[PDB]
Amino acid sequence: VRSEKDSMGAIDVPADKLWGAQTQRSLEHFRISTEKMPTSLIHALALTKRAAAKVNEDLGLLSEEKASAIRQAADEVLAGQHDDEFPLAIWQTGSGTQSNMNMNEVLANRASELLGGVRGMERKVHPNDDVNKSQSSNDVFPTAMHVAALLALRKQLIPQLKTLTQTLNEKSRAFADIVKIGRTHLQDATPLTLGQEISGWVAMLEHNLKHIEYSLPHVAELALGGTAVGTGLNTHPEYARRVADELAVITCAPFVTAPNKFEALATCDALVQAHGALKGLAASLMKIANDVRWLASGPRCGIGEISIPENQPGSSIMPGKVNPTQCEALTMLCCQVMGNDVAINMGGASGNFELNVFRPMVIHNFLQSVRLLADGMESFNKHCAVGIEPNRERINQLLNESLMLVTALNTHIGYDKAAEIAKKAHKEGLTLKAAALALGYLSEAEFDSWVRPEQM
Amino acid sequence: MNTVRSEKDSMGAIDVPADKLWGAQTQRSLEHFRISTEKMPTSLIHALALTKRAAAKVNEDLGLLSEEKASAIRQAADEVLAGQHDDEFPLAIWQTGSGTQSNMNMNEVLANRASELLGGVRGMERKVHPNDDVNKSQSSNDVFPTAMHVAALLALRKQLIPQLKTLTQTLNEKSRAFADIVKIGRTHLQDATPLTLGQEISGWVAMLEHNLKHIEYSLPHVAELALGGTAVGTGLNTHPEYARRVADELAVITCAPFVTAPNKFEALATCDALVQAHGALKGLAASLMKIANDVRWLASGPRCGIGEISIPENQPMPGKVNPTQCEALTMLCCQVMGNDVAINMGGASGNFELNVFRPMVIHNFLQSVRLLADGMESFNKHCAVGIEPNRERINQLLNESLMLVTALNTHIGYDKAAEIAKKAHKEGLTLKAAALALGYLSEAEFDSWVRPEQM
Amino acid sequence: MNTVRSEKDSMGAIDVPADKLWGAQTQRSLEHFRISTEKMPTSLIHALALTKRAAAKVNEDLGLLSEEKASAIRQAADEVLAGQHDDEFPLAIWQTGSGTQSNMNMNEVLANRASELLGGVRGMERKVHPNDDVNKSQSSNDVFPTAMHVAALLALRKQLIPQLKTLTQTLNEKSRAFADIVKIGRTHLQDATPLTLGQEISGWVAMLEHNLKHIEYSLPHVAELALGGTAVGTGLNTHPEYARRVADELAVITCAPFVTAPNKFEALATCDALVQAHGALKGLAASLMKIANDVRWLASGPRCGIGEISIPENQPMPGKVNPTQCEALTMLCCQVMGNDVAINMGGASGNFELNVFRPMVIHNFLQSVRLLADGMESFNKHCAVGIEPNRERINQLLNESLMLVTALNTHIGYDKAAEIAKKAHKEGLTLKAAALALGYLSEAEFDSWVRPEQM
Amino acid sequence: VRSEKDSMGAIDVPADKLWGAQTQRSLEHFRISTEKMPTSLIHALALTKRAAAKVNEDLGLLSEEKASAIRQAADEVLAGQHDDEFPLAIWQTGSGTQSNMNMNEVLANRASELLGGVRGMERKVHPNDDVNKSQSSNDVFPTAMHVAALLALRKQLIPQLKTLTQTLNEKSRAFADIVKIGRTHLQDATPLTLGQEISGWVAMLEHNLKHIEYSLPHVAELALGGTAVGTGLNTHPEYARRVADELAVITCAPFVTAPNKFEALATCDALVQAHGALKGLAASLMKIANDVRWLASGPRCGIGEISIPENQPGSSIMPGKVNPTQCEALTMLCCQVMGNDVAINMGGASGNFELNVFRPMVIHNFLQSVRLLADGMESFNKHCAVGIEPNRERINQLLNESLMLVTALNTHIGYDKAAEIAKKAHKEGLTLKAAALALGYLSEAEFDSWVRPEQM
Numbered sequence A, D: 001v002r003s004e005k006d007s008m009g010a011i012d013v014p015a016d017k018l019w020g021a022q023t024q025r026s027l028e029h030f031r032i033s034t035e036k037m038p039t040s041l042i043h044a045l046a047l048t049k050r051a052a053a054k055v056n057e058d059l060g061l062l063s064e065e066k067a068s069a070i071r072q073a074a075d076e077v078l079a080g081q082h083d084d085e086f087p088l089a090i091w092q093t094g095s096g097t098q099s100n101m102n103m104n105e106v107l108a109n110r111a112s113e114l115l116g117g118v119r120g121m122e123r124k125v126h127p128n129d130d131v132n133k134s135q136s137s138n139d140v141f142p143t144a145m146h147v148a149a150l151l152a153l154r155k156q157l158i159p160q161l162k163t164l165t166q167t168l169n170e171k172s173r174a175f176a177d178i179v180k181i182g183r184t185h186l187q188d189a190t191p192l193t194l195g196q197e198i199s200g201w202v203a204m205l206e207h208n209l210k211h212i213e214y215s216l217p218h219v220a221e222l223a224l225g226g227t228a229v230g231t232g233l234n235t236h237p238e239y240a241r242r243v244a245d246e247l248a249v250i251t252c253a254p255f256v257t258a259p260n261k262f263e264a265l266a267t268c269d270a271l272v273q274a275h276g277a278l279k280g281l282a283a284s285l286m287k288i289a290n291d292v293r294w295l296a297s298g299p300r301c302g303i304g305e306i307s308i309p310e311n312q313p314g315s316s317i318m319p320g321k322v323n324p325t326q327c328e329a330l331t332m333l334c335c336q337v338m339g340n341d342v343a344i345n346m347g348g349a350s351g352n353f354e355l356n357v358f359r360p361m362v363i364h365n366f367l368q369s370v371r372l373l374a375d376g377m378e379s380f381n382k383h384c385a386v387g388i389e390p391n392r393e394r395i396n397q398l399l400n401e402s403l404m405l406v407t408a409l410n411t412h413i414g415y416d417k418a419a420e421i422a423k424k425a426h427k428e429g430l431t432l433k434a435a436a437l438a439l440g441y442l443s444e445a446e447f448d449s450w451v452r453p454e455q456m
Numbered sequence B, C: 001m002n003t004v005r006s007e008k009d010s011m012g013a014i015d016v017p018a019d020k021l022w023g024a025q026t027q028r029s030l031e032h033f034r035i036s037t038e039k040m041p042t043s044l045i046h047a048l049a050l051t052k053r054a055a056a057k058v059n060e061d062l063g064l065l066s067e068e069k070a071s072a073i074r075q076a077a078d079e080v081l082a083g084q085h086d087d088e089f090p091l092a093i094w095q096t097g098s099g100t101q102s103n104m105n106m107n108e109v110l111a112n113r114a115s116e117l118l119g120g121v122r123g124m125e126r127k128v129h130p131n132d133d134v135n136k137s138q139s140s141n142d143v144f145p146t147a148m149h150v151a152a153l154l155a156l157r158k159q160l161i162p163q164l165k166t167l168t169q170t171l172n173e174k175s176r177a178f179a180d181i182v183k184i185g186r187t188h189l190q191d192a193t194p195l196t197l198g199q200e201i202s203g204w205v206a207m208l209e210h211n212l213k214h215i216e217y218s219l220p221h222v223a224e225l226a227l228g229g230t231a232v233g234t235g236l237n238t239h240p241e242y243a244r245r246v247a248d249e250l251a252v253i254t255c256a257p258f259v260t261a262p263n264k265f266e267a268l269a270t271c272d273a274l275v276q277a278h279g280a281l282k283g284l285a286a287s288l289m290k291i292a293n294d295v296r297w298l299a300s301g302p303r304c305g306i307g308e309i310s311i312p313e314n315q316p317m318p319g320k321v322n323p324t325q326c327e328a329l330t331m332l333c334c335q336v337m338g339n340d341v342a343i344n345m346g347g348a349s350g351n352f353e354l355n356v357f358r359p360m361v362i363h364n365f366l367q368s369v370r371l372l373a374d375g376m377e378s379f380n381k382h383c384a385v386g387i388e389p390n391r392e393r394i395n396q397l398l399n400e401s402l403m404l405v406t407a408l409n410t411h412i413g414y415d416k417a418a419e420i421a422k423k424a425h426k427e428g429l430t431l432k433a434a435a436l437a438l439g440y441l442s443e444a445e446f447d448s449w450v451r452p453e454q455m
Helices: A021-026 A039-058 A064-078 A095-115 A127-131 A137-174 A194-213 A239-251 A263-264 A269-295 A326-347 A359-382 A392-400 A404-411 A415-428 A434-438 A444-450 B025-032 B042-061 B065-079 B100-117 B130-134 B138-179 B195-217 B242-254 B266-267 B272-298 B324-347 B357-386 B392-399 B404-413 B416-427 B430-437 B443-449 C024-032 C041-062 C066-081 C100-117 C131-132 C140-177 C197-217 C242-254 C264-269 C272-298 C325-348 C358-384 C391-399 C403-412 C414-427 C431-438 C443-450 D023-025 D039-060 D065-076 D098-113 D125-130 D135-176 D194-212 D239-251 D259-264 D269-295 D325-348 D357-380 D392-400 D406-411 D413-429 D433-439 D444-450
Strands: A002-006 A009-013 A179-184 A189-193 B004-007 B012-017 B182-187 B188-198 C004-009 C014-016 C182-187 C191-198 D001-004 D009-013 D179-184 D187-193
Touching: A002 A021, A009 A021, A021 A095, A021 A404, A039 A064, A039 A095, A039 A127, A039 A137, A039 A239, A039 A359, A064 A095, A064 A127, A064 C272, A064 D406, A095 A127, A095 A137, A095 B188, A137 A194, A137 A263, A137 A269, A137 A359, A137 C431, A179 A194, A179 A392, A179 C443, A189 A404, A189 B242, A194 A269, A194 B357, A194 C264, A194 C272, A194 C358, A263 B324, A263 C197, A269 A326, A269 A359, A269 C197, A326 A359, A326 C272, A326 D325, A326 D357, A359 D325, A404 A415, A404 A434, A415 A434, A415 D009, A434 A444, A434 B012, B004 B025, B012 B025, B025 B100, B042 B065, B042 B100, B042 B138, B042 B242, B042 B357, B065 B100, B065 B130, B100 B130, B100 B138, B138 B195, B138 B242, B138 B266, B138 B272, B182 B392, B188 B195, B188 B404, B195 B272, B195 D259, B195 D269, B266 B324, B272 B324, B272 B357, B272 D194, B272 D269, B272 D325, B324 C325, B324 C358, B324 D325, B357 C325, B404 B430, B416 B430, B430 B443, B443 C403, C004 C024, C004 C272, C014 C024, C041 C066, C041 C140, C041 C242, C041 C358, C066 C100, C066 C131, C100 C131, C100 C140, C100 D001, C140 C264, C140 C272, C140 C358, C182 C391, C191 C197, C191 C403, C197 C272, C197 D098, C272 C325, C272 C358, C325 D406, C403 C431, C403 C443, C414 C431, C431 C443, C443 D392, D001 D023, D009 D023, D023 D098, D039 D065, D039 D098, D039 D135, D039 D239, D039 D357, D065 D098, D065 D125, D098 D125, D098 D135, D135 D194, D135 D239, D135 D259, D135 D269, D135 D357, D135 D392, D179 D194, D179 D392, D187 D406, D194 D269, D269 D325, D325 D357, D406 D433, D433 D444
Parallel strands: none
Antiparallel strands: A002 A009, A179 A189, B004 B012, B182 B188, C004 C014, C182 C191, D001 D009, D179 D187
């Protein structure tokens, strides 16, 4: 071990680790549960520092040898080389100071080595003086939150949603002719094509896409440039805008600086609004997943209208049993997003005066939902959605045995005789065909000709 | 009436309708809090009447209020308890977090009314005073919480619990009736090894039985009354015996095990008692939801669903019977869940000596109790009692299943049994047909060996 | 009236009160669904009237309903829209998940009424038929969702948005008025570098401005009407132009950008449009909550709190002004949060062609809109407009703070400045006193250098 | 790598890993997010198998050499030796089959080695035939859930709560004499002692203790012995009871077998009811934490009635700023438990027929809350609660400058003159003392004698 120090004294830190005193210190204070800052955030926090170092250098606030060294240290974190250099829990200070300092110390110690120097107190580059220049935990962490959010949605959620969309869209067109018995209130209703029902699913997803995209512009607003309370004290006029442009360059996202830093620092409104669209997606996905479970339920004592690919081997003496494992995993995560929304709301409404101190928790919950939904759709798509095939024999068996097709004989034999054969088919226990044929109202040629399900 | 009388509070005079018993403050609140349509529920109003009534009796016993004046306020409260002054409480839920306005509302209505019993009149020439007399040795801070717990305990004891016990007995009766009816099991929504309908139903009986215990465990805390702590909970300007005396009184009138809160600061600063109690409600809600969905799915059809059971047709496609009672119950179960969240936010939002989110908490709590109570009641008499088994179809499903293949193991061996099942599946045949197709056993043997009664 | 007439549906005859316009089904539902006190809100009833009205006009144009009979049903609907038949809709929220019973309720009330306009009477001798005439080319499945979105869009457009814009303008006005008033900042609840009150308030203005956009983005989806899909969404037994014609009609009467849902299956099988819309509401709720708490904390006191601002005294300890409007707003913000959860559970609980949790969803959605609407309105005219700064106290806090120590840096150096602050803290002195105690600067220099206007 | 196989074919599994085919198979199907089965559960799942192996042996269903080998393999998992042998995500099948098989394969491969045999297909001990004897994922996973739950509450949550209780209880008695200005509606109210206010906190915690303990008896019910649908098919009559007794022995908990296995398999009622008490605790903790933040807010522009120990160093030029970091971390996790309740409720109500398939998610959320709350109270206790000391000078300054003490002069000078001096003290801008002294109503000797805050 080596001795690190701050304004509170010296503290022993692992020799083989790049963090400093404050990280080692908060490590024995905030020892709560096992949740830590997710990779996507760590990278976003590194990107934030990288951009800030570039801007400081341009204003002459930093030397080239320093700024460049920091940028190179950041890029290493982005390359997954210092993943074990961030041991801080999510359950820390609400402003995320601990995590900011954590990134600062690790980034400073490494930049020192890259400059021929060494890690520790004799470091060439300084965490607060160099890496944390013209900024504060108050305005850095909200920025890292938005940078990680927009990118996670654009790079992960959106793509997976489109993929699942086109897949179900293909299925829609594919099964356009297959007609099946409808169902409202879990009861037998008027028929509709299996392709139209799936078209309901694709439409839902397409709606959620636009609803998610509507929330992006707000999440694009960066707080960097406001500092401690949002006034922008101790900064250059062009700083706020410049750090936003640099961010837009290296991430390729339409990042802009928040019009009002006071709104950015004291709230999480962008993430409360964006996550509102996510729970809306979870709601949609919950049904689409359930319709599959049910339609595919069976193979003998359920609905069994469709068939989904089997993933796990299962029993040998029971070859028919195929559990909707992909849907079960999908619905569970949908309950999870629903529950995460509450946690986020409670945190998003608990801000006070100049700063909201429920941030680490919000970003924790938000990013989890994006991972869950994004991975959930990809997993559902490949291991289920694409393998959906209709059980045509079972579909027709249920359509013919149904009593809803009596509606076609109303514009032929009348409402009196039509409802007469149906009430007799139900009461006794048979089909409509044999019911009308026995009453002498129609013949096998007449029934099969007039009762056409393909014409609704 | 277009005609109005001129009552007044510490801020000035205000026109109150001449045909109403409320005073200057209830009218001033009405014009400052016009938000939505929710008004304080009657169950809570009666709880307020009872609190004021209990206070009068005690104040009399402790010689703090004249007999003639105490009996007037007492008599006025009973009037409210008889459903005579329900239109005298217009104030919405969205008001002062302490429920001061509704406390004043009761004080004024009771003042003006009691004055008319003593021969006097309503208005400024009152013989009975709202704050001085009726709100004697009280505080809207310690009174409201009391009304809340009084309203909450009686709604649970005299409404919810009885209905919960009734539905249970019904379901328990059904379990024995269908104790021999064997039916296909379903895990992950797929066919599984069999079990009798009585067993599937006994699982519901056991759930409700567990909910009773959970709900009973949450009563002792709700029974704790805050009446006695006044302003900040120290009981300043009140009689030493007052708190225990009024708690005993309320206990005698309502026949409920009411006790005075052992710590007033916890009673005045939080809604914890109800936050824990509703936790039991959101539990039963989750339970009922499962019981409701199982019923409608098992009764789905009549041709393209499961259709193993039959439910009574209450509402007016010859055999399309919509499970409407299940839809009402499942809809309200979602409601109880959402209410829990609002109660949590409120119950956790208290500051220092007083939680000021009470009106919102009691509104959601009492609504949930009405829902779960009335929900189980109608679900019972309009569905649970008429549940009949579709023996014919249930048996048709057992035969067409492949899950009964295990019965052939002890007779012909797992491998042959497995083959039979694999064939029956690939070709879409019954275990009977497939077994006969390979010639592994005769029909006279299948109909003996695979005896579904053994599960 | 004790007297009753004898109406009847497909199940038999039932006694309906002779003084009521509803029929056999609305009465049968009433006796089968006695759960709680919640009834369909008037805002939704008028939405139903408008849907039926729109249907009549279109059915007439498409020659499916006789002129004399269409104008009667149309005239009867306008009657409801004028607040003349509010007591004719007793059915509770907890009913059929599709809202069929309330659809029938409107059909029967409109039938019996229209019959009286054509000279005929109510009851079985009707000249106008409930289902046949009024529910022409419709389905309670595609009608209810329409009424929901019609009720939802108008409540947002004609109520919520206007009030949101008003509060914003008020707050925006206040921001400019206090643009020069410097005050101590507070992060983590601790004193921080300064900022003017105008800036602290401009943060609220910006929040509400953002909420407007978010709420506006959620309107296009709510505008999609399901009317035209009938039973399962295929539009069986309906005119090809019907769907677009009725959508245009509704758009003309309400002046709202209503359009027919591009996909009926998504419209009939889910409540997604409202699930996404309420997501915007729970957002504004979270925003208002912050705006409400900031106000009451800044006005807390008058002696032992922060007390930087003053709020109008609406309710009647000489200077104890309780922030009641903040308490009503914060209480309802919790309510909107809990409602979101119930909407989520319902909106995610749909099966196949139809979601049967609609009554519960619209109840919570419309309540939230009333709350947020009426909440911002009263909060504005009874608080937001009267917000006054306590210049004297605000200045007293700036001086007694240590956060202004940074102004001494460019003049005497960080180290000396740090020392001054460390001393002032240890001994409990003002930066002035401590600076003078060490003799690092004169008073004539402190009062010049540390100029709070620079932040 | 080595080749493992099931009824679905061979699959390459890491040579250096103990799991089998089904684990390696579900590893590439259920690739969702980063959440995995928490240690406490893995141990509970191992304990379940250990107990089951002991019981099977007693009934003669298993040989001693096998049962004993399995028990030894389990004890190694419990000793944190195979922590990396469980890579399966939480987002899998709702019955937890994957995780059960995962435990089976890892436990079987190891037991084989312990028997002189080797890992792989040539294993001496078999996962399904030996380790998973007389049981199924349907009845094993719910048991592992309850075993981990009761133990987590008894061994972790309860103790931390008592510790925090006695600490605040000590503070209560300690500050019993110190009187402070009361506060209702955030406004100045009648006085009360600082010790009484803290007594409100201790009372809240004491209530939550009993409310948590009331939920334990239900969580003590085990499902083992019901199997697939709860009928107890393919088992010995004494099995169900015996596996429950064995569980009670090795864990030292009052574990009993569920009276009705149908209730145990199709619901999560015990955990929905138990977590109801947890959110009730989170609610209590939220306020207790907030009162501290506020009371300690300042040091000059807030309330500042109390002082809490400083953890992180902070700035040098701003020695007064002490952020309530411990409370911020505590409130965040309280929002988290609140949000977790919703996720659990949604999952606990979504069961169908004979089995609830939202289990992995529920146990995930439940166990997180227990960790959060338990660690949160310990962290709050040591790094804050114990260091709470009153700022007596600031407390009195605020008590004297208050206008609420005018109530004492009512039973002396009258309600007329008392309210007269107060209305003048407020209006002009001074204390009650100087206000009454200037009006000639009282003297310095009279005021300081009659106005006694210690007598309320």
